[PDB]
């Protein structure tokens with residue numbers, strides 16, 4: 001039913017190498033050249049990628065910031081409330097960002113907070129302003 | 134083993150009747166399965182009896198005595214079976230002391246052309262049957278293509294050497310009948326390149342398996358893809374080996390392409406991700422600046438100023454989270470690219486060194502078929518491979534010449550008698566022969582039938598070495614051009630000191646180039662005497678016949694010198710170099726299934742010729758011209774046993790037409 005293993009005798013390939021007297025060495029060098037093309041291409045991106053690597057030297061260690069470890073509280077100080085209204089104004093609804101900004105209240109409180117202080121801080125009016133941008 | 138062993142040893146199914154036997158015994162085959170089994174046993178038995186002692190005639194009575202009941206109840210059937218076996222050379226063939234001596238008065242006159250093994254086999258059989266046999270020989274010796282060189286103790290077959298296995302081989306019988314020094318072949322063959330350095334086991338084994346894998350490939354092309362005709366021409370075997378090597382070479386390239394195309398596909402996933410990392414670092418760089426500027430405003434600050442420091446801090450650690458995720462990913466791609474660079478696929482399908490060694494495997498094929506692989510039929514070249522005898526091929530130590538010479542004991546053999554014209558008519562035949570030494574002395578022979586064992590190369594000769602009157606019908610002449618008669622030659626190197634490995638019978642030499650793959654590519658140590666024997670196969674064969682013995686012998690020493698060191702190669706004492714295509718009594722070595730030919734052409738060769746009626750309106754006559762020889766036996770061509778079987782075959786068919794076949798009632 002099928003050829004010996006490793007032998008790759010397609011029904012369609014034989015005709016292509018049998019089509020003409022020099023057809024064999026045609027297809028065989030049509031690929032000899034195509035291989036070179038990819039090799040050429042590999043060097044290029046290997047250079048381009050190598051150049052980009054150099055630019056990233058230093059990584060971002062110098063631009064890194066120490067992490068704050070502050071115990072989440074549950075009381076809203078007048079300050080924290082104010083941080084909040086601004087965070088909504090600049091984030092809109094990204095719960096994590098707003099919790100990250102206050103860095104003491106959490107996403108549940110933050111999420112709760114909109115409904116608690118709702119008419120009081122005009123959050124709906126604020127949120128429209130965020131969506132404008 | 135048993136009775137059944139004798140059927141196998143006679144090339145016969147032990148449990149079914151052959152088409153042969155259906156012809157002689159149609160009552161049995163069309164009859165009840167019980168009688169068939171009786172018959173079959175009677176046959177299988179009788180075969181046994183002959184085989185266990187093949188040095189004495191097996192008379193019908195002898196058979197009946199040893200046969201037992203209930204099988205020995207129907208004497209006619211036993212007599213019917215034994216005659217059939219005897220007629221067709223399955224028993225009482227070869228060289229045997231006969232119990233009942235030859236009838237003093239013979240019936241019929243048969244001229245046999247050629248004292249080759251087919252010829253003598255028929256001759257012995259016909260004489261055996263009470264016919265008047267005479268063989269006409271062009272040569273001054275019998276055996277034809279069984280030639281043996283002899284000088285002092287030096288002995289080396291220029292002709293056949295090998296008995297291919299005794300499982301079912303009539304030569305098995307002959308060897309018991311004539312003492313034949315039958316020595317086995319140790320298959321181990323070490324290959325030596327042009328430098329004279331042996332090829333290492335790694336390499337030898339890896340190229341041999343490719344070679345077989347390559348054949349297995351051509352078979353697949355022929356049968357499953359039906360790649361048999363190309364450009365309105367039959368596909369040769371060699372053609373399809375090119376097309377298979379090319380396709381395996383293409384695949385090598387294909388897989389290199391696909392593999393590097395999988396590096397570019399990843400280097401470009403890296404380059405695109407590097408871009409994002411470089412654009413994010415700049416964004417981070419300027420964020421930091423903004424945060425520090427925002428952090429520079431010392432407290433106490435109003436909340437919009439506090440929000441800004443917190444907002445910038447949150448954002449910047451967010452981007453520092455992206456750039457960390459995007460450099461874990463860069464690590465994965467960097468290692469993934471590293472794997473791909475280390476697992477590159479095979480550089481080449483085969484190296485120049487590798488493919489030079491591959492050639493030596495094609496030279497072997499060329500030497501087996503005595504022809505360039507471009508002439509072999511793809512579809513049919515191995516058609517005779519089912520009927521291989523079992524057992525390991527042997528060589529004849531005292532020369533193969535002894536068989537032929539032993540078959541000529543008691544035969545009317547005119548040597549130095551070159552047949553030039555065969556004339557065959559409704560009423561009989563006459564063959565015209567000259568004396569080879571003085572071509573003018575002319576001979577006329579009359580006979581009831583001619584058996585022609587002229588080699589196929591002789592028959593192919595234009596202009597004709599032998600003319601037939603009337604000419605052979607085209608159906609015969611066409612099968613003659615269609616068929617292939619090829620070439621291989623031998624060089625016999627005779628030396629006083631054995632300076633090679635005496636425990637290896639054969640060892641190769643890898644030719645420098647493909648076009649010279651068969652020039653002395655194989656050497657044989659077969660003999661008690663110190664003789665190495667060099668083969669010239671493929672294209673080399675036809676070419677080396679235009680070159681001197683000395684020049685040919687030189688290239689022999691050279692190669693031997695290279696594999697053993699200039700020091701240990703003494704000048705050969707006696708040199709003989711065959712030139713079979715040149716020989717006009719052979720004009721070739723043996724037949725091969727040419728492209729465009731088939732196994733049916735051998736069948737064609739063996740159908741005999743019936744001439745036209747002398748007086749128009751007379752009844753359709755008897756056939757008068759019969760053909761034997763290795764080119765007539767489709768299942769066992771180009772072999773001494775095939776020749777022999779064809780002689781046995783025609784003898785029985787000639788006996789049946791002129792002595793009548795009484796075993797059919």
Ligand SMILES: Cc1nnc(NC(=O)c2cccc([C@H]3C[C@@H]3NC3CCC3)c2)s1
Pocket residue numbers: 320500501502514515516517518770771772
């Ligand atoms: C181990 C081995 N097993 N067999 C080995 N030798 C051969 O089969 C052989 C060698 C030379 C010539 C012929 C000729 C009878 C062949 N006609 C052609 C080739 C097959 C159809 C056969 S090598």
